[PDB]
Scaffold this active site. Sequence first.
Site, PDB file in Angstrom:
ATOM      1  N   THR A 154       0.818  -1.211   0.000  1.00  0.00           N
ATOM      2  CA  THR A 154       0.000   0.000   0.000  1.00  0.00           C
ATOM      3  C   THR A 154       0.863   1.278   0.000  1.00  0.00           C
ATOM      4  OG1 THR A 154      -0.224   0.091   2.417  1.00  0.00           O
ATOM      5  CG2 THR A 154      -1.876  -1.142   1.210  1.00  0.00           C
TER       6      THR A 154
ATOM      7  N   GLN B 195       5.661   3.128  -4.134  1.00  0.00           N
ATOM      8  CA  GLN B 195       6.329   2.265  -5.098  1.00  0.00           C
ATOM      9  C   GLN B 195       5.716   0.897  -5.232  1.00  0.00           C
ATOM     10  OE1 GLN B 195       9.012   3.595  -7.385  1.00  0.00           O
ATOM     11  NE2 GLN B 195       7.466   5.048  -6.542  1.00  0.00           N
TER      12      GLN B 195
ATOM     13  N   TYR C 258      18.171  -3.143 -19.968  1.00  0.00           N
ATOM     14  CA  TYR C 258      17.231  -2.689 -20.983  1.00  0.00           C
ATOM     15  C   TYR C 258      17.855  -2.623 -22.370  1.00  0.00           C
ATOM     16  CZ  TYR C 258      14.866  -1.281 -16.699  1.00  0.00           C
ATOM     17  OH  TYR C 258      14.303  -1.344 -15.432  1.00  0.00           O
TER      18      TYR C 258
ATOM     19  N   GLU D 244      29.932  -4.973 -13.922  1.00  0.00           N
ATOM     20  CA  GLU D 244      30.413  -3.617 -13.712  1.00  0.00           C
ATOM     21  C   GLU D 244      31.482  -3.738 -12.647  1.00  0.00           C
ATOM     22  OE1 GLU D 244      26.446  -2.138 -12.589  1.00  0.00           O
ATOM     23  OE2 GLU D 244      27.309  -1.397 -10.759  1.00  0.00           O
TER      24      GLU D 244
ATOM     25  N   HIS E 280      25.799   2.786  -7.786  1.00  0.00           N
ATOM     26  CA  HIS E 280      25.528   1.527  -7.081  1.00  0.00           C
ATOM     27  C   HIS E 280      26.375   1.365  -5.831  1.00  0.00           C
ATOM     28  CE1 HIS E 280      24.046  -0.521 -11.013  1.00  0.00           C
ATOM     29  NE2 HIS E 280      23.073   0.101 -10.363  1.00  0.00           N
TER      30      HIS E 280
END
Lengths: 388, 388, 287, 287
Positions: free
Chosen positions: C16, C19, C158, C208, C246
């Site tokens: 709830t 996000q 992506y 990475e 990150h």
Amino acid sequence: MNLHEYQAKQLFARYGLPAPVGYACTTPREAEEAASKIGAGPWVVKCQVHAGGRGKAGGVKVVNSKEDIRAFAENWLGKRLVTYQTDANGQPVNQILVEAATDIAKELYLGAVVDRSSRRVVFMASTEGGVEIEKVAEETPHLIHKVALDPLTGPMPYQGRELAFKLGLEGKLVQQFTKIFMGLATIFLERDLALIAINPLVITKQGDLICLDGKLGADGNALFRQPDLREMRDQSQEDPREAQAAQWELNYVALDGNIGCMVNGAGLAMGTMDIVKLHGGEPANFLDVGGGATKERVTEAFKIILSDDKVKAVLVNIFGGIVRCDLIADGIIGAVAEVGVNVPVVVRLEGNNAELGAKKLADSGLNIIAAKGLTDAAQQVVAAVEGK
Amino acid sequence: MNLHEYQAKQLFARYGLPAPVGYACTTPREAEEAASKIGAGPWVVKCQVHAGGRGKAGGVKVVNSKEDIRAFAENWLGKRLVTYQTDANGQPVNQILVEAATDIAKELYLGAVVDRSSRRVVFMASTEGGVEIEKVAEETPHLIHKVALDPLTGPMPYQGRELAFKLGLEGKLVQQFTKIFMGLATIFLERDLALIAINPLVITKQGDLICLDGKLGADGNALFRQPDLREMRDQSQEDPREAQAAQWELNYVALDGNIGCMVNGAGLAMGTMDIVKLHGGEPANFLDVGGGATKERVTEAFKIILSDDKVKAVLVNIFGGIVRCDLIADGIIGAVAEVGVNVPVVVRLEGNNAELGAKKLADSGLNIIAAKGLTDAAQQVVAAVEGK
Amino acid sequence: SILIDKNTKVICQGFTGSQGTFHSEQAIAYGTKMVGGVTPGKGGTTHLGLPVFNTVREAVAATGATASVIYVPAPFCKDSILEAIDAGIKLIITITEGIPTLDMLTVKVKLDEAGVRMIGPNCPGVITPGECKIGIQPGHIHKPGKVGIVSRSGTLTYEAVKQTTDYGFGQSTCVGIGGDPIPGSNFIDILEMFEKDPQTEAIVMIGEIGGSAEEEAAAYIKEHVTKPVVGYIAGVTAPKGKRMGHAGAIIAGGKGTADEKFAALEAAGVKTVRSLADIGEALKTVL
Amino acid sequence: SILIDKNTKVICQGFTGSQGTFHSEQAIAYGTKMVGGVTPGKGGTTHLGLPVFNTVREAVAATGATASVIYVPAPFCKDSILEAIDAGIKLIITITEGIPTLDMLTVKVKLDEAGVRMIGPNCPGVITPGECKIGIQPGHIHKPGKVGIVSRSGTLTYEAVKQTTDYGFGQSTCVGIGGDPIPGSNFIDILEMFEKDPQTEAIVMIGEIGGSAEEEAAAYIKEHVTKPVVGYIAGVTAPKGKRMGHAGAIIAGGKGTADEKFAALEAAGVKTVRSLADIGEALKTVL
């Protein structure tokens, strides 16, 4: 976040660990008065900056007189110390640590980090103190001993005894070492540290262990539950734009190159930087926005990237996020007019309205390109600087 | 070891848990002065003894006047309260707790123990407060909810929320309950408790959780690392011989029967008691010596067993240990002459010199038998009392 | 595919909230089987047409959900993951960023002894194009297919997705293992899943800087992964001892550089595209 | 036999102390293979003709010892057991009494995840009559044989030993699981070992008050132990909520009574001798 040597030592004090008697001083008078309070000379005076190698840079000296203490204090306070661990711009010295000199019999190393590979807090000790330890690891790795904290039990004493015996310590030093291992292990867990480095962990002529220097790194992710470490952050030690970006919810890391990179997502941001470099470019920074790419956020991202006068182009590369690829184009447009961006801006949009937005950009008339792909937006910003 | 209700509540206070405002009082004047300090009546006055059911025994009352407080204090102080959880001899009342009365909306139960079966610290809660919980478990076990502390993570909040929701708590009470679960869980671990029992854990008319009563049991094995709990031991609450035996390195537990049992090893001690009872006997106690069966230790064991005037025989049953079966016989001999043991003593030796010692015993002339086996030494001491 | 499919029933912790609501709305519309959510205090209500519960156990009892997606703020995340493990949940996807490293250190040990799989934390995402989407990603660039993708990066993924969808190649399942230094699952964990997935014909590994997980993965690949692998490592131009976004993006003590990782992989037989533009391309090779 | 045999090589933690010295002197003279001992600070010396080391790892490296016997005081015991688990030791026998329950709570979890067997703590003892003796017991009442014995009591065990040695029956191995409430190993653990030991033809189970380990054992016996079992429970006349010597000897909340245990066993097909005089006798039956 990093702490200053004096702060690490204060912390060490609260956990009963041993360190030289000293005072962090903010004025030459405070510094010289430290000598008297410390006792008989000589005294070690130390510029308090986050980087290491302060000594080789001459920011750490042993004086025999109050008159020299003051000298050193006037010399450094308000100036920037540049060591081999800071950029050529160096870091501001606002506190000078004045502590009693120490009679060093031997120099050891004791440190800890979160080992990603074993997924454990790992303490390492070496008889090779006073030296860049990454090198002791390279050259002579058999001289480095480790122990991982069991997350089910907490650090255990045998673990400190294990390291003490490997260092060949004996008698009272074994118990002292074990004591320090347990205390440092406790600060690490209780204060959510990311790093500890006692280099050098010193055995004194008088026969005791003492932390001659101390480097602490806190886990920034835990600062919400570490109020004390929270108030110790010293921003003057960090590139101000980083604090600026962060406050705006951007992640900025200045670089040498001339092409500003504004991407959404750290991995993309790094791949973008990498692809610009692949095509003769030279990335001026790392800036990651993510989702919330509002007009202000995109304009703040611009201000930050453009504060570096060596920026001769700005490459925007969005891909998704909560904002529609065209509201992102209007945000850029406005940032360009408003900020009066004085450089070519190549935009690579992707997602909803990738073209209603790539259009809006070409339709503006502002020196805003609109790349057709990645390897393209690459070549295009790389072009947009060729000889400038 | 057990603590007094006031001590549990002090502890609760240090961990920010909630309890009635009150004062442990050692005199009627102290008690009556408590009323004034507490505030407006009425007040609950409570005899501080380790056993439960003090209320049904009338050792817990609600008064409306200082004059009654004092009455109650004079009545009880220095006297022994006998409840259904104490022997008919009861326990001395040396402190009276005077605390503000509480407006009870509902009574709940919250407790914890080390569950042997799951080998975890287990917290249990029930909507059935104010009642002997062992019964709530018997009758209605679906009304008892539990959670085990994960020893790798520490108690977790969801665990307190789990219990709060099962108790049907809502709104602020859920957060209050979770808070108390975490604090009690923390005291349990930090203070090396063996037991916690908030019965009743009360929801007040004003809508808050409050510990109306509190029973804490500490792990005696951890007292070396619990100095504070160490100083709270109240010996007046224990059979003095237990403290006596313990100091002498014996383990004593008085019983009803008439046959004193002196064995080496708790399991043997219990099997011996059991075998004497199997043969019409009635074990007067449990006393376990172990190894060190020296002359003094064996004589101290005697003194302790013989302090109970209803003892009409003493059965010694050794089996091994660091002492030779005959040096044990001389030790008994001397204890019998010296202590002037006035009862038949049947000895069952086993190990080195089982007979050089069984001899020495018959050769003494002292009313010391020397059994030929176990089922034998059984019948023999059982005999040695037949009608006395 | 791996980890999830059209049948995975998912509950949401922190459902709830902003996000959790937003991303559940997405997962829902993608056909993902959100069977409900958990928010302490709001049990008994309904949100997004699904049931809302006070505890994860209540949720699991009520729905049989086996996977949980977590959008609970960092401070309360460890409590969240532990509640889930306790409740029986077998697959946890923790989106949450900023979870203290020492909490993940403990949670990782718990997940492992408890036989629970956690993807994350820190914005991971799992999507099996066609069947199930648990994440914050954009599933209209995805195409049910044959390429398996593991990445420490969301956005870099992506790109790879588009390239495989564009070469028509498709994606079996895409796993974002998150950007934190101690993740619930790492490369080797997911690589093994892909090696055993009939549907996965090629693997795209996206690393990475920081750690030595890639290097470790290389070695594993070199001896247990037979399917073809195309790897790309971001951060060749990253400065050392500087967090690159990150929490895990950082070269500590001169180790874990972009070049080291590239090297390690190349030395294990991995098509290492130097540009993330040529991932689709390089797949075209080996595939 | 089980747990140990003529080949077990044993090191001793707390070896240069009073009890460790004394009991090692015993184990030695029984032929037990003490290959050395560990005492922080006294590494490099020798005691009882064996080598003394500073750490258990040093000891294990130097000797290949796989079992460790612990005589370290309660306060330092957890550290001891953990050092041993860390060093590779696979069998630990902790004699030490008075170890805090919460320490055993942690050590038990560690032993289990680490695949290490611990007998104890609190005066257990293991003896394989003829081959190996690790303990404080009297091995000249023992006779290499066919009866397996598990007991929460030291002295009560001796009785049973004598009775089986006297009926000539013999002992395969005798295990004293200790008197603490959370032991490293319990009845079921050792029962399974006996069910699988060719040499063990009959099992003598010795319980007492407290816990529900016997009851649990009964159930296990009733479904997995085929060999015959003779059980005796001490403490029928014990008062409730009173510690009877053993930290674990206590009836808490009216549960774990001597009668309950007798009952449970009888209900699982166990020759329950009501007197510890008739253990040898009852074995004579079923055997």
